[PDB]
Amino acid sequence: SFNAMVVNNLTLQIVQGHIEWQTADVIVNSVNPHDITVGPVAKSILQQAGVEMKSEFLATKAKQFQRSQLVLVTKGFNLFCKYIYHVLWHSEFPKPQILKHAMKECLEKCIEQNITSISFPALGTGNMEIKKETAAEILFDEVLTFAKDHVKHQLTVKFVIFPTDLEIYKAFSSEMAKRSKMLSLNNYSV
Numbered sequence: 001s002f003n004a005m006v007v008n009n010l011t012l013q014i015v016q017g018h019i020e021w022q023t024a025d026v027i028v029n030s031v032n033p034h035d036i037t038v039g040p041v042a043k044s045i046l047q048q049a050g051v052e053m054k055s056e057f058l059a060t061k062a063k064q065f066q067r068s069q070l071v072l073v074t075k076g077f078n079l080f081c082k083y084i085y086h087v088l089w090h091s092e093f094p095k096p097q098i099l100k101h102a103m104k105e106c107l108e109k110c111i112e113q114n115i116t117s118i119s120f121p122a123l124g125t126g127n128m129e130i131k132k133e134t135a136a137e138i139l140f141d142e143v144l145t146f147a148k149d150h151v152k153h154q155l156t157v158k159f160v161i162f163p164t165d166l167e168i169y170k171a172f173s174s175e176m177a178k179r180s181k182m183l184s185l186n187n188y189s190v
């Protein structure tokens, strides 16, 4: 069994744990921009970051928010991270399409803000009801695009699967196995 792969300058690991207890430069949240207190990832991150993060979210939303915005950045506050990238769900468009755009944008922001590590939950797989295999294929696709198109930018990416979401874990681990075999990647068990 394995839970990590290395491709070019990118390390990808699947972790069973809590997104809000990660240590990384960036931790990714998943919210309704009109109420960041709804949803288990959202509540998890908010309670751990603290109420000051919500204040900053709201103030940044007032300055920046528009229909085109898919990712809003705040500081990490009491989280063990520099920034939180809040993925914003606020349209009627197909959720896998939104996911793909939001994933690419989070990774592109890693260049802009010179980020060395980023930890994602299984975005879209809860309230947004994206099929586990679809979510896995999109997340892997965008990470591998990054690894090829931004080859000089070292990055450690973690996909953090809630401990009891075993079916999601298995879908992500199956995807890792498929990509690793095809690309002859070296795998690790941590």
Ligand SMILES: Nc1ncnc2c1ncn2[C@@H]1O[C@H](COP(=O)(O)OP(=O)(O)OC[C@H]2O[C@@H](O)[C@H](O)[C@@H]2O)[C@@H](O)[C@H]1O
Residues within 6 Å of the ligand: 017, 018, 019, 020, 030, 031, 032, 038, 039, 040, 041, 042, 044, 045, 089, 121, 122, 123, 124, 125, 126, 127, 128, 129, 160, 161, 162, 165, 168
């Ligand atoms: N603390 C946690 N750490 C890691 N993963 C978690 C945690 N809590 C929940 N998860 C998992 O994260 C995934 C995403 O679930 P949601 O939090 O429901 O988020 P998502 O499916 O992306 O939908 C976001 C939507 O829900 C609310 O934020 C709001 O309505 C927003 O638009 C699911 O697999 C869920 O079980």
